[PDB]
Each structure stands twice: as structure tokens, then as C-alpha cells.
Design a protein around this nucleic acid. Structure first.
Ligand code: FES
Ligand SMILES: [K+]
Ligand SMILES: [K+]
Ligand SMILES: [Mg+2]
Ligand SMILES: [Mg+2]
Ligand SMILES: [Mg+2]
Ligand SMILES: [Mg+2]
Ligand SMILES: [Zn+2]
Lengths: 84, 222, 162, 154, 45, 38, 97, 176
RNA sequence: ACCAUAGUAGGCCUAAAAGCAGCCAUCAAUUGAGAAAGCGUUAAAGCUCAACAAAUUCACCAACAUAAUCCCAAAAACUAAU
């Protein structure tokens, strides 16, 4: 019985307006501003797959951030033989 | 604060199709209608077949000798299949299906008459022969956990070993043999026939070097 | 050495620690390049349960033994010292290192049975009712295997099991 | 062996190599001690996760940030630096407060709002102060007011 | 180099020597230089 | 108790202790974990 | 800290800690302060005020407690260790309650 | 006495599951929630999920605070798809530009989870992208109407293939 | 020892699947913390373990019941041993 409200299917409006952003009944669709006015840092993030271990740099926290994550993965696998 | 040690990476390992252990038949397809003598030299002495890894990185090393029949194959197959991850682990048999017939004469009858009827089939295993070889993209610590359970239930004493561990116990059986501070060793006395000891020793003791007695293999004897 | 003093003065409790002067190590050891105290004074493989003057420097005032971290002994020697102290207490030596209990000394018991070189504890050994013949003989342990590396002037190995 | 190797003097000490993570913390400590004018030390206290996050938000209102550094890479760095006199404050658990354009009137008020968050000390513009010195510095006027009254006295 | 010893309020008696020498330097100037010093300070501050 | 050959900890609160010349597995939360070496 | 939470700190009225952080024999007092000021210990009586007095030349690291019965436990921790201070605090709670 | 994490449609608190057995177990009637929460928000469309925090007090009273909607509904509405991808990674559920993710960041920047930490704008957008990694929607640098339109037709054909395949699968299970 | 907070009931799935039937992915806030290592719940909640800091003796492994007329030399850890 509980379902999400109907969404827009017009390609022209979806590519120019984000329908899901406006959640107020009294609100309106926020018109797309030119991409030049957009900050340059939103066109710099890793859109594709996440960085591997080698693409990072040892003199950067990103390498240690990912290496910390890998240590937890290694410790979790070795703990599969817990009898407790 | 501690040290972030690097983690091993396993990306060059390819998992073959059907990684679980293959089913083994209770009796070979063509039965042996001729009953042969119970050779016991197939257990005595060191193994010459299947003493090295082929594809995997972990295996069960047979320290002693013994016979494996269809019951032990079921125990090895069922335990490994339900305890490993098929996506990351693949296992391979290192012993053939049971082929040597074992004879059991009827209950309660006088000696004589001849060899009885064929009861079951066994697989002879010597000392130092790998039984089940497993490989994959996982470390040895977790593979060792559920392999010692299988190795404990085998007839002959056995251990769960890997590529690095097996070489270390072979590189220490030579260092312990090179630095021995005892002038007299079984190899020197037996071969040279000192004290007329050949009357007590067996002709196979020249090759065994005193490390093998019957089907029992003591690795601490130099 | 530091001691703790607790005082009750009219519903007020005061707890303070006072430092007492501590005897220091002797100035000149025969082997200055040693690591642990035992082998620094050439006492390696040369002490036994009788050497009270040595075992009385690695024990607490109430019979306990100091931790290996404080003393600095190596693990191999620390276990040997621990074994000797246990054997010394059971042997009857070190009489001033027992705790004081005024209520318990009055009810005397059966007189103490003199003993020495007791490996186990008196309350944890069961009589050997079925000893056995010479081909399977239950031998009563004497001393500890940790002290089999001591120097033997006679040259005969020490008989630990008899 | 004639003499057990344990009793023999230890072998020459192998040279430990500092990794990237250790060297990363070395320059961050150097950076946070270089471009920042106010460095306030504090005794870190185990608080509620909601309360700890609330403290971060409140300090954000006055541009005050807080960072935590392990003593393994901080004590050797401060020993060789010009702030060696803060070493007694960095023996146990610790917390570091960082601010630009220092102003402790809005910082002490937050600290006094929680009675169990001690303010050990710190260095303000290459000058080491105690808690009382921080309190006196808090009641002290700003540069404009003090300098404006300086010409009045002269 | 090294930093200061962080004197306390229990026995606060030692003022910085840099202030003391500045007082002597200021006091070692004539009233004409007082006006010059004041005017420069007023212009800057 | 349960006279057993090899002692294993069934839960993380079991603590080994050697009394009367034998090792005993004593547990506080679950008394059923009490084991005794033979 | 975990020991104090299980023992019911609700019978403690007021705790104050006076120490000089710039001294050498105040490490023990710091550890005692962090244990009694932990989140678990705090959530036992929402009336108890923990005071962390900080001085420089006081030269007397001390801890003062007042129990519900009305006794005054004051221990000057300069040579005592953190374990000794906490254990004494724990012992008085059971007796005075 | 505790905290309750419940997602309720705007002004659609039903006197039943999942609100009934959960909120009523602590000792709070639903008719109280039929007036408080429903009147709490009246300018928000019903059917849009809203993660709400309920703090039940020892006197059986309660407090309600409303946060921003979930990321799942935002990106599904941004991509115009009714549900997420069944197999994430194998298939792409929806295609959106960087404007949708960036614009969502401001809406969620005022959420109590992110606003309290005063996270920068770059913090929120990465979380939305990370959420889209598991949601099946691929972020696109920039696209136009026809590029999006082509994806819709391809998605419909694959959806229709799975829609009818599921119908056959259910029939196979029942008959066998 | 000490210590636990973000998106977020991730998608799918199911009567309900909130780290914890299964499928799929395994990104991401914070100096710090795994779309989860274990327990638990109908589902949640909750406890614990990895990561913060603190801090630094050492810690792979080695446990196995009993017979019948009455146990069975006595006893002993150092005075010099090819
Ligand atoms: S280190 Fe030489 S005897 Fe202890
Ligand atoms: K066996
Ligand atoms: K699940
Ligand atoms: Mg991360
Ligand atoms: Mg932990
Ligand atoms: Mg029995
Ligand atoms: Mg007799
Ligand atoms: Zn237990």
C-alpha cells in the first residue's frame, strides 16, 4: 500500500531539472544553472571505480586510509574460525 | 599507535570450475576377479609419488603410512566441502580411488581352504605423500583451521602444511643433519657393517637410514 | 622502597605513600657486560635451593616472588629461581617470610615433617599404592628438571627420579 | 654453545625505518605548530559520543578545531623542537586545541560549562601559559584596546 | 632554542627583562623625543 | 563437572586454573562449561 | 573505570581533583581523574559534581571525596599508583553503603 | 527509556505495522502519533520516506524530530526509476548527471547527521555518490535528453524481460 | 586495558530481512571504526571483537580410566669415574 510517489519520465525535464530535490508541496523544480557557474571541484571526483592500492601514494593519507581498511578485511577473514 | 603492515594480495589465482572435491566410487568400475597377495612394501619406506605441490598452496602431509578406504574419502570430502568457500577455495585429490582389494574370510572357521572373498578396497599411502591439496586466494591460517580436523581423523598421523612450512621443515631436517655433534650415525654404521650389525638390520635399512621402522616414520631421528 | 599508610582520624581517611631508602647493587661485578643479574655475577648454573642468600633478594617480605619485569632476570633463569624459592619454602628455610596471623599460631597442629627437594606440593600428591615391578616402576620425583643444568663436580648426572 | 647468546651483549641494533604514515604525522605536527597562533592542550576525557560530537559543533561556531596525535610521533618531535617545555603535559592522555586569531573568552566558557574537562596549559604566540595564565589572558583586552590605552598612559 | 619556564601565580615575582630594558630606553629620551615617539605611535596606532 | 581428556574453552569467560595437580576449566556465567582433566 | 561502574557510584556525593600538570609525579593523579570521569561512571548519579582543579606551583597532587554517610576520604596521590588509588576508592564504597 | 528509528510517510501514520507493534510495545498509543506526526509536517507529500527519531521517555511520553529523507528515494526519483537494481554492478539501474547529486547535497546538508558535524559540501556529495555505487545508479559527467532516453528504452526492455521471467519462475515453483 | 559515533532499513529479497536466511555490491563522514568477526531479536533493540587514543615482561604447540589371594629387594638428587 505504501509506495513512492510517481516520478517524472520526460527526458527533457529530467536532464534540466532534478525532480527528487523538491520535496515540498509548495516548492518548485530548481532550474539547472550553467555548468560554468558550478564549482570546479564537483567535476574532479572519481566518477568511475574506486582507487586501487597502487594508484595512491605512500606520502598521502589516502594510501593509509585504504591500507587501514584492508587490515580489517584480513583480520575478519582470519576470524571465521571463532568457537566463541 | 601501531604499525600498518601490508596485507597479502591474491589476484593471480584463478579458481577452476567445480572447485569442490570430486566424488570417489566405493568400488572401481571393473572389479578385480583375481585376488593378489597383500603387499606390505607399499606402506613401508618413504614415498616416491606425489611429494611436491602441483597447483595449490596448502596440503595435508602424511607423516606415517596407512590404508585409506571409502570411509575416509567420505570424511575428507564432506568436511572440506561444507567448511570452505567455493568462490575462493579449490581442492584437488592427490590419491587415486580405492583399487587394492582386501580379503576377509568368513566368521568363525578353521584355518585353511584358501583366500576368502574380496571384502572392500583400500588405497595404500606412504610417508611424506600429500593427500588433499587445496589452493585459493586466502591465507594459510584459516585453511589450517579446518584441515587439522581432517588430518586428525586419518589413520596415519598427519599435519596441515603449506608451501612455506613444508620447505622450512625440510630445510631444518638438513641443518639438523649437517650440524650433528655425534660422530656415529645410523647411515655410517649400517652401510659400513660395523660391529657386524647387518645380522640385526634389514636390507631395507640401508636406504631408510634408520628413520623408518615398519610403517612408522619418526622425523626426529637423524 | 615505597610503603602505603592509611590513617583514620575522625571520619577522615588519609592515604599517603612514603619512600624508604633502598639498598643498591654492589659496585664491581665480575662480568660487567652481562645482561641479567644472575649471569652478571657469574652465578649461572651455580646456585641451588640451599643458597638462601641469593633467593632472599628476589622475593617479597611475605613470601611472594617479585615480577620478572622489575628484577630483570631472563625467562630461563626466572623459572629456575621461582622453582628454588618454592622448594626453599617447603624445605623449612626462610622462616621470617611467612605472613603474620596472631590468631592462627596458638592452635598448634601435628609437628612439621622435615623435608627437602620437594618438587610438588604436600597437598597434591597421592600415595603410590600399586608401585609396580622393575619393568614398569613408578618413581617418586625428587628435585626439579629445571636444575639439571647445574655444574656437577662429581661428574655423575643428578638422579631426579628415585 | 660455550656461552648462551642471551647472556652475551645484544647484537648491533638494526636501523628502524620511518614509514610514510609516521613521516606524514611529522609534517602535520610541524604544520599545525607553524601556521597556528594559539595552541591549547587539554586532558582528553572519555565522554558520550553525542556529547563529544556536540563539543565539536560548539567549537566550530568559533572556528576552534581539535586534533589528537599519538605520543609515539609527538613526544620525539616536541623534544627536538622549541616547545620542549610542554613535554610534562604530554605524558598521559591528551587533547590539542587549535585556533586562528586567538580568542579564549569563548573557549573557556565552553570549558567551564563542563566541570570535568581540565585545561592543563598551552603556548600562545610562542609564550607558555598555565590555566591561571589563560584565565588572566581571557580577562585581558584585545590588541586594539590595550594599544589604544598604551598611548593614554604614555 | 627553548621556551620559557611558565612561572605561576603562587610566586609571581620575575617580570620579563625585555620590558625592563624598554622602560630604561624610553626613560633615556628627552621630552622632544617623547612627542616624536607619541606622534609616531598615534600615526601607526 | 565433566571429566574430559583435552580442555577447551566453550566461551570467552572460561579461565584455566591448576588445582590439586590437574587443570580445571572454571566458568562463572555458564556452570555447564566446568571441565576436569583426567 | 569499568570497576567503578559495576560498584554503584550513586552513594558518592562530591569528588574533586587538585593537581599540577607541570609536575613529574602527577601522572597517577591524571589516570585516576580519567577513570572516575568516564562516561560510565558519570551515568550513576546526576547530582554528583566532579571538579578538576588545576594549579602550577601547588606541588600537592591530591584527591578528595565525600561519601553519602558523611566521611571525608582525602588521599594525596604523589607516590601512589593509579591502581592503588582506584582500589582504595572502591573499597570504601562497599563498607560505607 | 530508549530511541526508536522508524521511517514513516509524511502524515500517514497507520495504526498497525510496522509502527504499531514497535511504538506500542514501549507503551505509546498510535492515536497520539496520528495527531503529532501528521500535524508535524503538512507541506510534505505523503509516500516520501522520512527517517524519524522517536525518544520514548520513562513516563511513556515521547518526542519527535524529523530529518531529511533517505538517499534511496532521492536518486530513484532523480533517475526516474521505481526501484533499485536487483544485481548492483552487473546492471545499471538509472543514469543521472552531476547536478542531481550536487543539488541533493544542499538538501541533506541541513540533516541533523551532517549539519551537526558541519561537514563541507564535498563531504555530502561523496556520500551520495558512494550510496549510488550500491544503489545501482551510475553518476554521469553530463548527458542530454537523447542519451537519457536511450537508457530508458534499454532499461525497459531488460525490466520487461525480468518482469515476465519472474512470472514464469513463480509458476515453475508452484507447479513443481 | 580502554573504547565505540555518519550517510544507512545500501540495493534486492521476504509476512517482516535495520552489519548479522539468501542474492548483489562492498563505496563513504570523522584523526579514528569492517554495508561486518561473533552472540542475540519474529524482525528491531542490545552485548562483544576489529579501528581511535592509552600503553608495552612473556605467551606456536605440547593435558587420555580400571580386575579380581597380599603392594613388592631395601634405599639413595654430588668427596673427584673411559
Ligand atoms: S641473561 Fe645470562 S643468566 Fe640471565
Ligand atoms: K590419528
Ligand atoms: K539480511
Ligand atoms: Mg573510511
Ligand atoms: Mg577494540
Ligand atoms: Mg570411571
Ligand atoms: Mg617387599
Ligand atoms: Zn564458559
Amino acid at each position: 500500500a505504501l509506495k513512492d510517489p510517481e516520478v517524472c519520465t520526460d527526458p527533457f525535464r529530467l536532464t534540466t531539472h532534478a525532480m527528487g530535490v523538491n520535496i515540498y508541496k509548495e516548492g518548485q523544480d530548481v532550474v539547472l544553472k550553467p555548468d560554468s557557474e558550478y564549482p570546479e571541484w564537483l567535476f574532479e571526483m572519481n566518477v568511475g571505480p574506486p582507487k586501487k592500492l597502487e594508484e595512491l601514494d605512500p606520502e598521502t593519507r589516502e594510501y593509509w586510509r585504504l591500507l587501514r581498511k584492508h587490515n580489517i578485511w584480513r583480520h575478519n577473514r582470519l576470524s571465521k574460525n571463532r568457537k566463541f | 599507535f601501531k604499525t600498518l603492515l601490508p596485507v597479502p594480495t591474491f589476484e593471480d589465482v584463478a579458481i577452476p570450475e567445480k572447485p569442490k572435491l570430486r566424488f570417489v566410487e566405493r568400488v572401481p568400475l571393473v572389479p578385480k576377479v583375481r585376488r593378489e597377495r597383500k603387499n606390505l612394501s607399499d606402506i613401508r619406506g618413504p614415498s616416491t609419488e606425489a611429494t611436491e605441490f602441483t597447483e595449490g598452496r596448502f596440503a595435508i602431509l602424511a607423516l606415517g603410512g596407512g590404508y585409506l578406504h571409502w570411509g575416509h574419502f567420505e570424511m575428507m570430502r564432506l568436511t572440506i566441502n561444507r567448511s570452505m568457500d567455493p568462490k575462493n577455495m579449490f581442492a584437488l585429490w592427490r590419491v587415486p580411488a580405492p583399487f587394492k582389494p582386501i580379503t576377509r574370510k568368513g566368521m568363525g572357521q578353521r584355518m585353511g581352504g584358501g583366500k576368502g572373498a574380496i571384502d572392500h578396497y583400500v588405497t595404500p599411502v606412504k610417508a611424506g605423500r600429500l593427500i588433499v591439496e587445496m589452493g585459493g586466494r586466502c591465507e594459510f591460517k584459516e585453511v589450517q583451521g579446518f584441515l587439522d580436523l581432517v588430518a586428525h581423523k586419518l589413520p596415519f598421523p598427519a599435519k596441515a602444511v603449506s608451501r612455506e612450512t613444508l620447505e622450512k621443515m625440510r630445510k631444518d631436517q638438513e641443518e639438523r643433519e649437517r650440524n650433528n655433534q655425534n660422530p656415529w650415525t645410523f647411515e655410517r654404521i649400517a652401510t659400513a657393517n660395523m660391529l657386524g650389525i647387518r645380522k640385526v638390520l634389514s636390507p631395507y635399512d640401508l636406504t631408510h637410514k634408520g628413520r623408518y621402522w615398519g610403517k612408522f616414520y619418526t622425523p626426529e631421528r637423524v | 622502597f615505597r610503603e602505603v599508610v592509611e590513617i583514620l582520624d575522625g571520619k577522615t581517611t588519609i592515604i599517603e605513600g612514603r619512600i624508604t631508602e633502598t639498598p643498591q647493587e654492589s659496585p664491581n661485578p665480575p662480568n660487567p657486560t652481562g645482561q641479567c643479574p644472575i649471569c652478571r655475577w657469574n652465578l649461572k648454573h651455580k646456585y641451588n635451593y640451599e643458597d638462601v642468600l641469593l633467593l632472599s633478594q628476589f622475593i617479597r617480605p611475605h613470601g611472594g616472588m617479585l615480577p620478572r619485569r622489575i628484577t630483570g632476570l631472563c625467562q630461563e633463569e626466572h623459572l629456575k629461581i621461582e622453582e628454588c624459592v618454592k622448594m626453599a619454602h617447603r624445605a623449612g628455610l626462610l622462616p621470617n617470610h611467612r605472613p603474620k596471623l596472631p590468631e592462627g599460631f596458638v592452635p598448634k597442629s601435628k609437628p612439621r615433617l622435615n623435608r627437602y627437594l620437594t618438587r610438588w606440593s604436600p597437598r597434591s600428591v597421592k600415595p603410590i599404592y600399586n608401585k609396580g615391578h622393575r619393568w614398569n616402576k613408578v618413581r617418586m620425583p625428587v628435585g626439579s628438571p629445571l636444575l639439571k643444568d647445574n655444574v656437577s663436580y662429581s661428574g655423575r648426572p643428578l638422579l631426579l627420579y628415585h | 654453545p660455550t656461552i648462551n647468546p642471551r647472556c652475551l651483549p645484544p647484537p648491533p641494533t638494526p636501523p628502524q625505518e620511518e614509514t610514510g604514515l609516521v613521516r606524514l604525522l611529522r609534517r602535520e605536527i610541524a604544520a599545525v605548530f607553524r601556521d597556528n597562533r594559539m595552541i591549547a592542550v587539554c586532558q582528553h576525557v572519555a565522554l558520550s559520543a553525542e556529547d563529544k560530537l556536540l563539543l565539536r559543533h560548539q567549537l566550530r561556531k568559533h572556528k576552534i578545531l581539535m586534533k589528537i596525535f599519538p605520543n609515539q610521533v609527538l613526544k620525539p618531535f616536541l623534544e627536538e623542537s622549541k616547545y620542549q617545555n610542554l613535554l610534562p603535559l604530554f605524558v598521559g592522555h591528551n587533547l590539542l586545541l587549535v585556533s586562528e586569531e586567538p580568542k579564549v573568552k569563548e573557549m573557556v566558557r565552553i570549558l567551564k560549562g563542563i566541570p570535568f574537562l581540565p585545561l592543563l596549559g598551552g603556548c600562545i604566540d610562542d609564550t607558555i601559559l598555565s590555566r591561571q595564565g589563560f584565565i588572566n589572558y581571557s580577562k585581558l583586552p584585545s590588541l586594539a584596546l590595550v594599544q589604544g590605552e598604551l598611548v593614554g598612559g604614555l | 632554542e627553548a621556551l620559557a619556564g611558565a612561572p605561576l601565580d603562587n610566586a609571581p615575582k620575575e617580570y620579563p627583562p625585555k620590558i625592563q630594558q624598554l622602560v630604561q630606553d624610553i626613560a633615556s629620551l628627552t621630552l622632544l623625543e617623547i612627542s616624536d615617539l607619541n606622534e609616531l605611535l598615534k600615526k601607526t596606532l | 563437572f565433566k571429566t574430559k581428556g583435552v580442555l577447551k574453552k566453550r566461551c570467552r569467560d572460561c579461565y584455566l586454573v591448576k588445582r590439586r595437580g590437574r587443570w580445571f576449566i572454571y566458568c562463572k556465567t555458564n556452570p555447564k562449561h566446568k571441565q576436569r582433566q583426567m | 573505570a569499568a570497576a567503578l561502574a559495576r560498584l554503584g557510584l550513586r552513594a558518592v556525593k562530591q569528588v574533586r581533583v587538585q593537581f599540577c600538570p607541570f609536575e613529574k609525579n602527577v601522572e597517577s593523579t591524571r589516570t585516576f581523574l580519567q577513570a572516575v570521569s568516564s562516561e560510565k561512571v558519570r551515568c550513576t548519579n546526576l547530582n554528583c559534581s566532579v571538579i578538576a582543579d588545576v594549579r602550577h606551583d601547588g606541588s600537592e597532587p591530591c584527591v578528595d571525596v565525600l561519601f553519602g554517610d558523611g566521611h571525608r576520604l582525602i588521599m594525596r596521590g604523589a607516590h601512589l599508583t593509579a591502581q592503588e588509588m582506584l582500589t582504595a576508592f572502591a573499597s570504601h564504597i562497599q563498607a560505607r553503603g | 527509556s530508549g530511541m526508536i528509528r522508524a521511517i514513516v510517510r509524511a502524515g500517514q501514520a497507520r495504526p498497525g505495522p510496522p509502527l504499531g507493534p514497535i511504538l506500542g510495545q514501549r507503551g505509546v498509543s498510535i492515536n497520539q502519533f496520528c495527531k503529532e506526526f501528521n500535524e508535524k509536517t503538512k507541506d510534505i507529500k505523503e509516500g516520501i520516506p522520512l527517517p524519524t527519531k522517536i525518544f520514548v521517555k520513562p513516563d511513556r511520553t515521547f518526542e519527535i524530530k524529523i530529518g531529511q529523507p533517505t538517499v534511496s528515494y532521492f536518486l530513484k526519483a532523480a533517475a526516474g526509476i521505481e526501484k533499485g537494481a536487483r544485481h548492483t554492478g552487473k546492471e545499471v539501474a538509472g543514469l543521472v548527471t552531476l547536478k542531481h547529486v550536487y543539488e541533493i547535497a544542499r538538501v541533506k546538508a541541513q540533516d541533523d547527521a551532517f549539519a551537526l558535524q558541519d561537514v563541507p559540501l564535498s563531504s555530502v556529495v561523496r556520500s551520495i555518490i558512494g550510496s549510488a555505487r550500491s544503489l545501482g545508479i551510475r553518476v554521469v559527467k553530463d548527458l542530454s535528453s537523447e542519451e537519457l532516453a536511450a537508457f530508458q528504452k534499454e532499461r525497459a526492455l531488460f525490466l520487461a524481460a525480468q518482469r515476465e521471467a519472474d512470472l514464469a519462475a513463480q509458476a515453475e515453483a508452484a507447479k513443481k
